[PDB]
Amino acid sequence: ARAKAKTRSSRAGLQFPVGRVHRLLRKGNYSERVGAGAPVYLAAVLEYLTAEILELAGNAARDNKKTRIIPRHLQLAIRNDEELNKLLGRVTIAQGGVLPNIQAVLLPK
Amino acid sequence: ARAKAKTRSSRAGLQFPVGRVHRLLRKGNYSERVGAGAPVYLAAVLEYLTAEILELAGNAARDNKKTRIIPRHLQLAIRNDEELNKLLGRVTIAQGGVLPNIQAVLLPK
Amino acid sequence: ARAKAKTRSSRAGLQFPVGRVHRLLRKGNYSERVGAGAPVYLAAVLEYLTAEILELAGNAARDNKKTRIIPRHLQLAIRNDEELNKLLGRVTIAQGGVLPNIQAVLLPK
Amino acid sequence: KVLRDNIQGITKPAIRRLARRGGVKRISGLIYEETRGVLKVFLENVIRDAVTYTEHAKRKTVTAMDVVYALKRQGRTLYGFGG
Amino acid sequence: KVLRDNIQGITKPAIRRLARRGGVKRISGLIYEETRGVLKVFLENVIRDAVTYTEHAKRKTVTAMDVVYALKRQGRTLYGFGG
Amino acid sequence: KRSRKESYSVYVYKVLKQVHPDTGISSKAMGIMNSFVNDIFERIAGEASRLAHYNKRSTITSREIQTAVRLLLPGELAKHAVSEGTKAVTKYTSA
Amino acid sequence: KRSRKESYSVYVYKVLKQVHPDTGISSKAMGIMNSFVNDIFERIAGEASRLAHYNKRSTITSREIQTAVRLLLPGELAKHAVSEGTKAVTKYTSA
Amino acid sequence: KRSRKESYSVYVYKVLKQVHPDTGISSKAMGIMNSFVNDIFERIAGEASRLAHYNKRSTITSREIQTAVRLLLPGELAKHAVSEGTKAVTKYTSA
Amino acid sequence: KPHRYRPGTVALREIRRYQKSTELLIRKLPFQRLVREIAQDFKTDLRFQSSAVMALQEASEAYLVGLFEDTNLAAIHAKRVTIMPKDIQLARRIRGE
Amino acid sequence: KPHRYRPGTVALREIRRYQKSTELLIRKLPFQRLVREIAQDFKTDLRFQSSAVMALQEASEAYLVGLFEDTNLAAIHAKRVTIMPKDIQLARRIRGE
């Protein structure tokens, strides 16, 4: 007499797993008691965050005419967004490189 | 009928409260369970740090011939010890001020 | 119905035997009456002095790459501190030798 | 209540006082404007953080303990206010 | 079994390549040894905590995960090796 | 076999086919993605824990999670985040 | 009728006495010490929770506490600190 | 078996395993350690009897041997040993 | 003729004074007025505990004075004694803000 | 006449070349030898994953390239184009180590 086994990510209509992060907060020791809506909230936040960084990365990959995403494009995408750079100024990307940047006085006349 | 009341700080033989640190770590939510010696050890290392920093506070106070401490002397104590500065680089003391420090080029001749 | 035989060395939380030192004061013929705190105090000061001279033994052993103490380590430890020298000016250590010390006029040009 | 030009409420000789505490021997006349700007940015960030803290707290009043939290999460911790 | 000098294993042209990636077009001769010194400092600060992490795990083989923890505690967190 | 090891590969791969059906991933880039998910996840979780400790509340709820993302994520990205998250709340409350 | 606000004030004043019986205290410096011990306490507690999470231990033990003591405190402070902590936990073990 | 010869070997062994778990002991240096502990004991106990004599006091207590260690052993080690001795007599006072 | 010190001597004197002193170098009332004025921009009708205002007072003074020895190191690093706005811009951008 | 470029032009060309490329600049086996050497200074006989060594070398090169871009900013601020170790000492002092 049980209902169909339905998923909370589909209940939000989002793709990140609600139950996984709910378990993660239950075992990550941040509260002993967890509300229902907060894991849904954070899952939506993170899925969107992946959405804009994947958009920037895919646009960079299309600009560099490569159809499979590479860490160099990740570095070039994140270092070219001001608010994400403020978010991610203190983090280092493996095999990433940096922005192409020369100073004006370093260039010849 | 019952054992006489004697505190766990006496059992450790040190002044910081074993019971209060135990309670704060239990409700500070850092693990599901807590070992017995861990908060005792934490209180011991804290009181060691307080021991040395109040030694520095005391002798800096006798440098200025004041029997009651000023936070100026605390800032002097933190900035005159290199390892305590390394512990406390990114924290500033209220009414702390700065070390007496002049650049050599700023002096005459 | 007797309580468990628990030791005054543990009561002072120190390694040196409080009872044996008390006995050796009692039959050392220094007073017919002796307080309880005096052998504890003696145990304390002798712990601290043996502790500091054993730290000196440890680093004097370690910098000469030896993991077992030798009386040369003891001599080099004691004679390199002036304060223990004022404690132990008239004191000879067996197989201790002397400090490496050559007067400046003895050295060639 | 409602005010307009309090960026100049930090006077130029007060900025000179901070600079002499900083050990500055000579100060340009241009300095005071960008010091006002940098102070503006810094206070704007930390008080945005503080008002975020207290609006979570369902308090209409600013508390110092929230200011302590806001400063220490930015890596500029202060002592002396119950933190 | 033991090694005594590999700080010269970071050669000058590798430093030069780093400086070009750093955007330096002109490098003094005095740069290389002091960059080796600060590299020495940074590697000591990371590997001390790294082997500390390792020994608490009762392992004699290090994990890269512990290196991730060491760098993120030091404030230079790394992406690309967790998991 | 081997004990199961968690990853975020498949979810980010659905996100990719939603945002760019044409492209693929490198495993190095996906390692960076997993590190990113875990890093931002722990930052907001630590904010959640400290804020719940500050107001002496035994529960964690979404309300301080808007507080956390608004303090941590800057500006318009944060307000966008509020938009999708609160509408996700509306669908979850409507089940 | 009032409700308490705790502090570390009595312990700081006592340890001030056995370090130096003849010196005084100002209240705002004593609050600075209160917040200082709170800050060191929270740093060690968070690092301890992280280490317990890393080695999948649900119990926090003194082993990782003193491990964190070397982790944060530099050198001289660390080695003396582990010295008093070790001798203290041995006195407690005897107790 | 021969009658017991009481010596101060095992205690120095224990205190060295608090101060250096790793380092070893030569037996002639160990006799040297017994000579320090016995000799300083002799000096301080004779001074304690003497100071009890001059103030016409029948009882050897901690305060006059504090006086004596301030007399003989100089300066920094003296004031530190005063600190551990006060700590020890206070905690032994608390049994 | 009236006494007049050479430049820098007086400045070194209050350098020594304010290094010795700990008191707050900003006038309290316009400072808290600025705090209330800017705090109005994010939410209306905020009330302030005074101790919070003095706390963020020394927070501001500490932040500015820290970037001031940063500026001083930049200025002596360029073999100059007078600071310029690009010194502060340099110092902040090295700190990464 | 054998061709020879004017100085800095080729240097700018490696700037562009290794700033477009990401592949690692240091020989990995000597730095592996060095990290084993410095690891033995704390505790005897450690074993290393190659993943750990490569991960720490990205972290190291990121730290170095950060401090080179800071000393670029310092040297340009000093109206010069050549880096000298006092510029690096300035940058390390400003960052707060």
- Token readout for H34 is 């017994």
Task: Tell me if A71 and E80 make a contact (CB, 8 A cut-off).
Answer: yes
Which of G18, G86, G90 faces H87 most closely, judged by CB atoms?
A: G18
Q: Does F53 touch chain B (CB under 8 A)?
A: yes
Cα C56–Cα C61–Cα C65 angle in degrees, nearest 5:
145
3-state secondary structure chain B: CCCCCCCHHHHHCCCCCHHHHHHHHHHHCCCCEECCHHHHHHHHHHHHHHHHHHHHHHHHHHHCCCCCCCHHHHHHHHHHCHHHHHHCCCEEECCCCCCCCCCHHHCCC
d(CA G34, CA G28): 9
Backbone angles phi, psi at F21, to 5 degrees: -65, -15
Taking CB atoms and an 8 Å cutoff, what residues of chain A touch E79? 91-94
- Residues I47 and D50: beta-carbon distance below 8 Å: no
Backbone angles phi, psi at E41, to 5 degrees: -65, -50
Long-range contacts of I61-66 (CB under 8 A, 24+ apart): I61/D18, I61/D21, I61/I24, I61/I25, I61/I26, I62/B92, I62/B96, I62/D76, I62/D78, I63/D39, I63/D42, I63/D76, I64/D18, I64/D22, I64/D35, I64/D38, I64/D39, I65/B98, I65/D18, I65/D21, I65/D22, I66/B92
Q: Which of I9, B46, F92 is CA-nearest to residue G66? A: B46
E interface mutation test: which of A24, A75, A78, A92 has the most E CBs within 10 A? A92
Buried b (16+ CB within 10 A) or exposed e, J47-69: ebeeebbbbbbbbbbbbbbbbbb
Residues 8-67 of E with CB under 8 A from A: 21, 23, 25
Long-range contacts of E26-30 (CB under 8 A, 24+ apart): E26/J8, E26/J11, E26/J81, E26/J82, E26/J83, E27/J82, E27/J83, E28/J82, E28/J83, E28/J84, E28/J85, E30/J84, E30/J85
Helix (H) or strand (E) holding D78: strand D77-79
Deposited resolution, Å: 6.0
d(CA B54, CA B74): 9
User: Pseudo-torsion of CA H70, H73, H76, H77, nearest 10°?
Assistant: -110
- Indicate contact of B with I: 3+ CB pairs under 8 A: yes
Domain carrying residue D18? 1-83
User: Pseudo-torsion of CA A31, A32, A34, A39, nearest 10°?
Assistant: 50
Which chains contact H through at least 3 pairs of Cβ atoms less than 8 Å apart? B, C, G
A–E CB contacts, 8 A cutoff, strictly below: 26
Chain breaks in chain D (C to N over 2.5 A) after: none
Q: Does C13 touch chain G (CB under 8 A)?
A: yes
One-character DSSP codes across F10-56: HHHHHHHHHH-TT-EE-HHHHHHHHHHHHHHHHHHHHHHHHHHHHTT
Task: Tell me if B93 and D77 make a contact (CB, 8 A cut-off).
Answer: no
Task: Tell me if A71 and J76 make a contact (CB, 8 A cut-off).
Answer: no
d(CA F43, CA F37): 10
Q: Does H67 touch chain C (CB under 8 A)?
A: no
- Residues I37 and D16: beta-carbon distance below 8 Å: no
In the PDB record, what is the listed experimental method? cryo-EM
Q: Does F62 touch chain B (CB under 8 A)?
A: no
Taking CB atoms and an 8 Å cutoff, what residues of chain B touch G22? 67
- Residues E79 and A93: beta-carbon distance below 8 Å: yes
d(CA H85, CA D22): 46
- Number of separate domains in chain E: 1
Taking CB atoms and an 8 Å cutoff, what residues of chain D touch B94? 78-81
Domains of chain H: 1-95 (1.10.20.10)
One-character DSSP codes across chain H: -------SHHHHHHHHHHH-SS-B--HHHHHHHHHHHHHHHHHHHHHHHHHHHHTT--EE-HHHHHHHHHHSS-HHHHHHHHHHHHHHHHHHHT-
- Residues H77 and C51: beta-carbon distance below 8 Å: no
Residues 12-41 of J with CB under 8 A from E: 12, 14-15, 17-19, 25-27, 30-31, 33-41
Task: Tell me if J18 and E21 make a contact (CB, 8 A cut-off).
Answer: yes
Task: Tell me if A103 and J72 make a contact (CB, 8 A cut-off).
Answer: yes
Q: Which residue of G has its CA nearest to C51?
A: G83
Q: Does F71 touch chain A (CB under 8 A)?
A: no
- Residues J36 and J30: beta-carbon distance below 8 Å: no
- Residues J10 and E16: beta-carbon distance below 8 Å: no
Task: Tell me if H19 and C55 make a contact (CB, 8 A cut-off).
Answer: yes
Q: Which residue of B has its CA nearest to H95?
A: B10
d(CA F62, CA D66): 20
Q: Does B24 touch chain F (CB under 8 A)?
A: no
d(CA J93, CA I91): 11
One-character DSSP codes across A32-101: SEE-SHHHHHHHHHHHHHHHHHHHHHHHHHHHTT-SEE-HHHHHHHHTT-HHHHHHSTT-EETT------
What is the rounded radius of gyration, in angstroms, for the C-alpha atoms of chain I? Answer: 18
Taking CB atoms and an 8 Å cutoff, what residues of chain B touch D25? 103, 106
Helices B71-80 and G27-54: angle between axes, nearest 10 degrees = 40
CATH number of the domain residue E7 falls in: 1.10.20.10
